[PDB]
Paper text:
In a surprising twist to this paradigm, a naturally occurring bacterial DNA polymerase I member isolated from Geobacillus stearothermophilus (Bst) exhibits an innate ability to reverse transcribe RNA and other synthetic congeners (XNAs) into DNA. Here, we describe two X-ray crystal structures of Bst DNA polymerase that capture the post-translocated product of DNA synthesis on templates composed entirely of FANA and TNA. The structures reveal a Y-shaped architecture common to A-family polymerases that encompasses the catalytic and exonuclease domains of the enzyme. The catalytic domain is further divided into the finger, palm, and thumb subdomains with the P/T duplex bound in a groove defined by the palm and thumb subdomains.
The only exception was the FANA template, which contained uridine residues in place of thymidine residues, as FANA thymidine amidites are not commercially available. The crystal structures were solved to resolutions of 1.6 and 1.9 Å for the FANA and TNA bound structures, respectively. However, the post-translocated product observed in the FANA structure reveals formation of the n + 2 nucleotide addition product indicating that the polymerase underwent two rounds of catalysis. The first nucleotide addition generated the correct fA6-dT10 Watson–Crick base pair, while the subsequent addition produced an fU5-dT11 mispair at the n + 2 position. Relative to a previously solved Bst DNA polymerase structure for the natural n + 2 translocated product, the misincorporated dT11 nucleotide occupies the same position but exhibits greater rise, tilt, and twist than the correct dT5–dA11 Watson–Crick pair observed in the natural system. The second nucleotide adduct, which is presumably due to prolonged incubation of the enzyme with the TTP substrate, provides structural evidence for a fU–dT mispair, which could be relevant to future studies that examine the fidelity of DNA synthesis on XNA templates. By contrast, FANA maintains the same C1′-exo conformation observed in the solution structure of a FANA duplex. The shorter P···P distance of the TNA strand is due to the backbone repeat unit of TNA, which has 5 atoms (or bonds) rather than the normal 6-atom backbone repeat unit found in DNA and RNA. Both strands of the DNA/FANA duplex have P···P distances of ∼6.6 Å, which closely approximates the all-natural DNA system. By comparison, the DNA/FANA duplex is nearly identical to a standard DNA/DNA with a normal six-atom backbone repeat unit. Several unique interactions are observed between active site residues, mostly from the palm subdomain, and the chimeric duplexes that are not observed in the natural system, including eight new interactions to the DNA/FANA duplex and 13 new interactions to the DNA/TNA duplex.
Residue numbers in the entry: 300 to 876
Amino acid sequence: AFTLADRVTEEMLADKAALVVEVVEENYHDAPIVGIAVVNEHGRFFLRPETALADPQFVAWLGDETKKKSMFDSKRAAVALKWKGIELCGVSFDLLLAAYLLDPAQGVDDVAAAAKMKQYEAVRPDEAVYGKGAKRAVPDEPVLAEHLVRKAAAIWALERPFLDELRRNEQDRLLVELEQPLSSILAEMEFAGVKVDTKRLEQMGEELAEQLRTVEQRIYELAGQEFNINSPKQLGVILFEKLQLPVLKKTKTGYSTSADVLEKLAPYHEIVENILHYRQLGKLQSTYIEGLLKVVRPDTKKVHTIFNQALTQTGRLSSTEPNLQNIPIRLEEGRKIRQAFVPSESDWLIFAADYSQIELRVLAHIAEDDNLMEAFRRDLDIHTKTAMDIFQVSEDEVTPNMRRQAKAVNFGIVYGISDYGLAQNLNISRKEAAEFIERYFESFPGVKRYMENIVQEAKQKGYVTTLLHRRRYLPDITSRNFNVRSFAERMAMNTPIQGSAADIIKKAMIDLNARLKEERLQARLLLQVHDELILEAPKEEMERLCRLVPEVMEQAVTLRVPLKVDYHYGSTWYDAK
DNA sequence: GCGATCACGTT
DNA sequence: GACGGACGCA
Ligand SMILES: [Mg+2]
């Protein structure tokens, strides 16, 4: 029972409403709005967007921060409206973000999935209404309107139960003061986009094409035959049947040709180093050059990423189209791809600031490890210090390989890799990897106690938490399957570290955005990837940003150790180093 | 077009 | 020990 409205009425513009502004295209940048639903104290309404979005009263209502709206994935609507020149304000509850906080492992894709968390089933999944893949389509208006009204009615009914559970979890401020404000900031970042030097990218592609053509010819000569080097199956036949190289590792289907396996084969045949070079050149070309050019909008000459704020179980952001976090960080030629990301206006520059070792600093804080805290209080090189402690040697006795091994132990902590993974990364035995870890724990006994205590807490409570009260449930922590249990244990250890770093970065973004407005700077946030925040600003704002940005980031939270920020500016993202 | 795989960046 | 370009069927 709802009103299919042909005009906007005052009844539709109440102080509080559930609002659905439906964008069916997966990528919502400059995408159609196919329909609108409003549920409030006065009734339930379906509005056609060509009418409502042309109505000055409805547009004023949308932009009025005192008119409160409950939505699901408000950033999607906010950005689609930005492309139409319409501001969305007053979103006081986002059911997507609420469900994400309550349990990020549920994978809540749509209103129906969130509704099922509270035994509400009077709404269909989006996939059931719009179909999948090739058959995907907007249905006729009667079907569309009922769906959008059912989604709005679900939001209207679910706000209270969700807020009640968030309050019980001490997550209500996490939603209202962190994730929801961040959603608006992300919306602005996505809409602003990042300018891309497509001429430079095409230049890079041309250079890669030349080098690829030469290595490919080298491989055919060495193989005595032409084949598709990009086919693992064809390559396996050349390597393991034609050239009779050893089979050191299998796949489920045939022989593995992974880079790990190939490096082990390099001493036996000159073709192997060439295949490795082809693979590295080819992934830069196909994935990062051509992949980037594919998602540059020809109308803006910018990339307009979509952040997924409700995906990871740590609380880190993710992004797509492009995913700029997946650009390799190793200089070689991977990092140079950042040269293609330039300021959007003449006489502007890129300003980039990154937290230095925020994850290990968070660990020092949470574990209250005296040795690790003092190391950061002295602003030591943490990998050199870790090697000094593990090997019981003075700083001048730390060899490069000692530091490399200490760094791998620290990497293992930051990313939650097992002793098998440490052994894999260091190319040592599992017993030797285990012995390394015990030596580490002798030097950092507070870290060891934390690791023991957090696994026990996960077993007792069923979940672990971050500094700002994000939760991750770990039902597998007592699995009788060793691999499943071990993974759960590593996530118990790692999520309070990685997730607290994510919390701090998100708070820094909110604080930064507010400070930039308060200072009346034109500088704007563009991207957040890894532990870095990337802005662009007039060149005349750089000196001010050199003081302001690190200060805001260092002060986002107060820990038992300082937060350290590195910062640079330049004519491209790469040169902001 | 869709599903199953393989590889390689990130986490 | 998830998240995001390159063989058969049908
Ligand atoms: Mg780091």
